[PDB]
Amino acid sequence: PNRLIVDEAINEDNSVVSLSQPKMDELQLFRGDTVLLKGKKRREAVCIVLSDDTCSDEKIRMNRVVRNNLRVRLGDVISIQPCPDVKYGKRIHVLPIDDTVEGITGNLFEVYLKPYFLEAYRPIRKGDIFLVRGGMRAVEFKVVETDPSPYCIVAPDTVIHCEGEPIKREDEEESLNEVGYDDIGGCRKQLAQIKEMVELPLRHPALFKAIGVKPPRGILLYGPPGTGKTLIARAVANETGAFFFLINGPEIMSKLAGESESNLRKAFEEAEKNAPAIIFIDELDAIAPKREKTHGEVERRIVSQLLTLMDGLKQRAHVIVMAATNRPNSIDPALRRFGRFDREVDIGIPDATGRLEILQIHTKNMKLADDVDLEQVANETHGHVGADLAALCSEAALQAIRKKMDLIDLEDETIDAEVMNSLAVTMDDFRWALSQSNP
Amino acid sequence: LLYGPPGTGKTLIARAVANETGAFFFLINGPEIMSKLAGESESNLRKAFEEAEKNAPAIIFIDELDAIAPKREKTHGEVERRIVSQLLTLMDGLKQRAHVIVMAATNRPNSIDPALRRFGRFDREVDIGIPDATGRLEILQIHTKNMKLADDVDLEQVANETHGHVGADLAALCSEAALQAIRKKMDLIDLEDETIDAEVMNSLAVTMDDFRWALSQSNPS
Amino acid sequence: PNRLIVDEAINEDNSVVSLSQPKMDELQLFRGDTVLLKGKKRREAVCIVLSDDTCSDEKIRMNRVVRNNLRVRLGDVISIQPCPDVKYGKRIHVLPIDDTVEGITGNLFEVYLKPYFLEAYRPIRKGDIFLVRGGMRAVEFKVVETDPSPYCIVAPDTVIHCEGEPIKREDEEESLNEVGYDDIGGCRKQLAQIKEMVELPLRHPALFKAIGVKPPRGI
Amino acid sequence: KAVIRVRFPDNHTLEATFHPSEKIQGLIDLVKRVVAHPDVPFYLYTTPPKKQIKDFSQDFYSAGFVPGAIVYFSN
Ligand SMILES: Nc1ncnc2c1ncn2[C@@H]1O[C@H](COP(=O)(O)OP(=O)(O)O)[C@@H](O)[C@H]1O
Numbered sequence: 001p002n003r004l005i006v007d008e009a010i011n012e013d014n015s016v017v018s019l020s021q022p023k024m025d026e027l028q029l030f031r032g033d034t035v036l037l038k039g040k041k042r043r044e045a046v047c048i049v050l051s052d053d054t055c056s057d058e059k060i061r062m063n064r065v066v067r068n069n070l071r072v073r074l075g076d077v078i079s080i081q082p083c084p085d086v087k088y089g090k091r092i093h094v095l096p097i098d099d100t101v102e103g104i105t106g107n108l109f110e111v112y113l114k115p116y117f118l119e120a121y122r123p124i125r126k127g128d129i130f131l132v133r134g135g136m137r138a139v140e141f142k143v144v145e146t147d148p149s150p151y152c153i154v155a156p157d158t159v160i161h162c163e164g165e166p167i168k169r170e171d172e173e174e175s176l177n178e179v180g181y182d183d184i185g186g187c188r189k190q191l192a193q194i195k196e197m198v199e200l201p202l203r204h205p206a207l208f209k210a211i212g213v214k215p216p217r218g219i220l221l222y223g224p225p226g227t228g229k230t231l232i233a234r235a236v237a238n239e240t241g242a243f244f245f246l247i248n249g250p251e252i253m254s255k256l257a258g259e260s261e262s263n264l265r266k267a268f269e270e271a272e273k274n275a276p277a278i279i280f281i282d283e284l285d286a287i288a289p290k291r292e293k294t295h296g297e298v299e300r301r302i303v304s305q306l307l308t309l310m311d312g313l314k315q316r317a318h319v320i321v322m323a324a325t326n327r328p329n330s331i332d333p334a335l336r337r338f339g340r341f342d343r344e345v346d347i348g349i350p351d352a353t354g355r356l357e358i359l360q361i362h363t364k365n366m367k368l369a370d371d372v373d374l375e376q377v378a379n380e381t382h383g384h385v386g387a388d389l390a391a392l393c394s395e396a397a398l399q400a401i402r403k404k405m406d407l408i409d410l411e412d413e414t415i416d417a418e419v420m421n422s423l424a425v426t427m428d429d430f431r432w433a434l435s436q437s438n439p
Numbered sequence: 440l441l442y443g444p445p446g447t448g449k450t451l452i453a454r455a456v457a458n459e460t461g462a463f464f465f466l467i468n469g470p471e472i473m474s475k476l477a478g479e480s481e482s483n484l485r486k487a488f489e490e491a492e493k494n495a496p497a498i499i500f501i502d503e504l505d506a507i508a509p510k511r512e513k514t515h516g517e518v519e520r521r522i523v524s525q526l527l528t529l530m531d532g533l534k535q536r537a538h539v540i541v542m543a544a545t546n547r548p549n550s551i552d553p554a555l556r557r558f559g560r561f562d563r564e565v566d567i568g569i570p571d572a573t574g575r576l577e578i579l580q581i582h583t584k585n586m587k588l589a590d591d592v593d594l595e596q597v598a599n600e601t602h603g604h605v606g607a608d609l610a611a612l613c614s615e616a617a618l619q620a621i622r623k624k625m626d627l628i629d630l631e632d633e634t635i636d637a638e639v640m641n642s643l644a645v646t647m648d649d650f651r652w653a654l655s656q657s658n659p660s
Numbered sequence: 661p662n663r664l665i666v667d668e669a670i671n672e673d674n675s676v677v678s679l680s681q682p683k684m685d686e687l688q689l690f691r692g693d694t695v696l697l698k699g700k701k702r703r704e705a706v707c708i709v710l711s712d713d714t715c716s717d718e719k720i721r722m723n724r725v726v727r728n729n730l731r732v733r734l735g736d737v738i739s740i741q742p743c744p745d746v747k748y749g750k751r752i753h754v755l756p757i758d759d760t761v762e763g764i765t766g767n768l769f770e771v772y773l774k775p776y777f778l779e780a781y782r783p784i785r786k787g788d789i790f791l792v793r794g795g796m797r798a799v800e801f802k803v804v805e806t807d808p809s810p811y812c813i814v815a816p817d818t819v820i821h822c823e824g825e826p827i828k829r830e831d832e833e834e835s836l837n838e839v840g841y842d843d844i845g846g847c848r849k850q851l852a853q854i855k856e857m858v859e860l861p862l863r864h865p866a867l868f869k870a871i872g873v874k875p876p877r878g879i
Numbered sequence: 880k881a882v883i884r885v886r887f888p889d890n891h892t893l894e895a896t897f898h899p900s901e902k903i904q905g906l907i908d909l910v911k912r913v914v915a916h917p918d919v920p921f922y923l924y925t926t927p928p929k930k931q932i933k934d935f936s937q938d939f940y941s942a943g944f945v946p947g948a949i950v951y952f953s954n
């Protein structure tokens with residue numbers, strides 16, 4: 001069957017997909033062959049099929065780029081056609097995106113295309129969006145026009161023209177800068193369980209509407225601060241194409257008494273209007289302490305208001321509430337109700353493999369030296385949280401800049417991207433950054 | 440007054456009683472009353488009783504009494520004391536020409552304002568304990584009465600693997616098992632385009648395997 | 661090269677600077693020989709070089725005084741020119757600053773200049789600002805005019821004209837009364853840690869303007 | 880069997896069947912025969928991602944050319 005369901009890819013590439021050996025044997029697909037991908041909104045995409053034993057026959061593994069290019073999300077069905085006939089690119093015209101080039105002036109062609117395209121022979125089509133990583137960032141690019149039509153393969157003989165004129169972002173076309181499942185690391189089982197619980201409801205509200213079974217109204221996320229729960233919740237909402245509103249306990253607490261309730265009410269009403277939507281509470285503990293802990297009458301009114309809003313939430317509303325708390329001990333008894341936050345998710349400290357995995361995600365935009373080993377650094381950190389690793393990478397980057405760039409001190413006015421490209425982080429920098437560890 | 444742990448289902452019992460006895464039913468939710476501002480709150484309470492008297496015979500049920508009326512040592516608000524006072528005033532204000540039954544749902548006996556134990560007030564006290572195996576077998580039967588099961592499915596054995604599980608937990612365990620089954624069979628075919636008919640959903644059968652999966656999941660709530 | 665990076669000075673002297681032994685050998689600089697310093701805002705300065713093993717070849721050690729005089733801060737780049745040909749002062753005219761003299765009236769020439777400028781042969785340039793310490797305080801001064809142009813070397817034979825008229829403080833010109841690294845003691849590794857953390861962000865917004873790395877916001 | 884395609888720079892395709900037991904060396908030795916410049920040095924890489932195989936003893940199953948694949952030719 002040509003029909004398949006989009007799945008997460010293990011391989012991290014623009015134009016790489018993954019299918020089952022039998023599926024390839026069935027459709028007579030060769031490892032290097034180029035498959036044509038038909039999505040929704042009369043959009044088509046070109047990719048390179050690959051053989052993966054792990055992959056299930058009925059599922060296809062692909063990256064956030066092709067999904068966005070195809071305008072499809074997880075729990076949507078696509079159609080794959082073999083494309084035996086393919087001709088090389090003669091000429092290509094591409095213009096970068098305004099938001100990607102922000103704070104970069106100079107000749108970027110030599111430091112983006114040349115590195116990225118090095119006898120890659122990647123297939124592309126006119127009006128396709130692809131992502132290039134350089135200068136310690138991820139720069140999205142669009143295909144303005146191609147002499148060969150509709151699609152072609154990149155060749156070293158082929159001339160690629162790049163002009164320093166940005167194109168205005170299009171509100172239909174979501175950027176890749178957004179938080180994604182690939183951007184979340186150090187949790188496998190935790191993420192999977194969370195994904196499937198909210199998969200069902202958000203994708204098919206009409207099913208849940210026509211079924212007696214009710215979807216879980218409230219989901220609670222455990223674990224210490226710096227683990228990254230917001231980041232987990234945010235990615236899901238963006239990936240599921242559901243309206244995402246973030247509520248911050250301090251922000252709600254800051255507002256004066258009598259308005260706090262208004263703001264909360266406004267937020268919940270707004271979710272109903274833009275339903276299906278996801279509401280996320282960040283500092284739940286701050287909003288609602290324990291009954292013995294709270295000594296303010298006004299505080300009790302705010303808590304009561306939240307409880308009323310939670311009860312108020314219906315099936316028809318199709319709004320999922322996600323709350324984060326540091327410790328289970330500091331939880332209001334009332335919150336632990338089937339009606340309300342029935343669903344509870346325990347986030348354990350990430351394992352060494354998870355910690356290593358996190359490092360790979362943080363270092364994907366930046367340029368690493370051969371001598372630098374993430375595994376060894378991952379081994380040295382036992383109780384370091386995801387945030388700690390990011391801070392270490394940030395601190396290591398700053399040290400690396402101080403060690404090289406400060407000596408030159410040629411950073412006057414506009415800074416060339418290519419200079420930043422030449423900069424590489426040494427293993428010693430990481431060791432220097434690791435040395436200065438104290439919470 | 441109905442003593443029992445949350446989830447036991449006291450609201451459902453009351454609500455049902457009002458349905459089957461063909462008597463007007465009025466639900467009061469502690470937070471909903473607490474959400475309202477000082478003075479407005481008192482009004483709504485006063486507005487609820489008068490409306491119950493108007494539509495007599497009526498039933499007034501408090502979902503979360505402990506919240507409205509916690510113990511006097513635990514209350515630290517002057518306004519909070521005015522709301523309890525208003526409730527007590529509404530309870531003592533009730534006559535025999537009202538023909539209005541007041542039912543309340545609470546948890547622990549030690550989170551109770553002694554004021555509610557008055558002979559004139561909540562004299563009747565009903566200690567709803569956790570159901571035995573049979574009782575929970577009786578619940579599973581209830582929550583499997585619309586859905587289509589398999590011959591291989593044995594509630595007795597499921598009524599033989601939860602110990603400190605309440606009505607909600609079993610209802611949850613039913614929900615999840617059913618949702619899980621749909622993923623296992625329908626997410627693979629996945630023909631959820633436009634309207635969904637009954638004929639495709641009649642074929643849907645839940646295996647024991649579904650139940651085995653849902654049970655493991657740790658829920659201390 | 662003639663390009664170097666401003667660094668903290670160990671010596672507590674206003675008109676003294678230091679470089680590395682190798683750096684001196686490269687530019688054939690003599691320990692005593694006066695060095696001309698060009699910074700920013702078309703300003704120049706004259707100091708006395710020194711040899712420090714600790715100092716790096718590409719860095720230069722200097723005090724708060726010269727920074728102000730050159731209108732530069734730490735991390736900035738200055739140009740050093742050798743100045744072998746310098747002529748001795750004949751007539752010098754200096755007026756004190758209004759805020760510095762506050763609370764002190766009378767003849768200060770005998771108790772500020774005489775003590776400070778005793779057999780030192782200090783080099784100064786017209787329109788520069790120098791600090792003398794007297795009467796249990798720091799008193800800043802401005803060179804109004806010098807007979808030799810542009811710069812000159814203070815000599816015992818040279819006559820310095822002191823008249824009791826204060827010049828108005830200028831908003832561009834920052835006073836040395838202000839708190840500085842030199843004024844903070846009893847912190848080494850800690851000062852350094854603090855310094856290096858805020859060094860990049862504060863000096864160059866453009867670096868953090870266009871980068872994926874967030875600087876520390878709260879310390 | 881295992882289908883190995885060689886894509887030349889100058890829009891030339893060579894379709895050659897092989898056995899999963901047969902080593903990489905054999906194919907390289909075949910390519911040397913097929914090309915008119917054996918003395919000329921050449922390297923066979925598979926993209927994406929850009930990577931060449933320095934091992935001649937590595938079998939095709941292990942190499943991941945199952946059932947068939949295409950490899951580019953460069954000098
Ligand atoms: N799974 C993860 N993978 C990578 N980085 C993570 C992950 N979880 C958290 N982080 C990092 O932790 C930091 C804080 O994330 P989060 O916990 O959502 O915020 P907060 O600190 O307010 O609780 C961020 O800088 C983020 O990069």
Ligand SMILES: Nc1ncnc2c1ncn2[C@@H]1O[C@H](COP(=O)(O)OP(=O)(O)O)[C@@H](O)[C@H]1O
Pocket residue numbers: 843844845846847
């Ligand atoms: N490192 C230091 N070097 C010199 N003086 C210092 C230092 N740290 C503190 N002091 C002196 O200690 C006093 C108090 O310093 P500070 O802690 O900034 O203020 P306060 O004591 O009023 O809170 C001041 O007289 C200040 O000059």
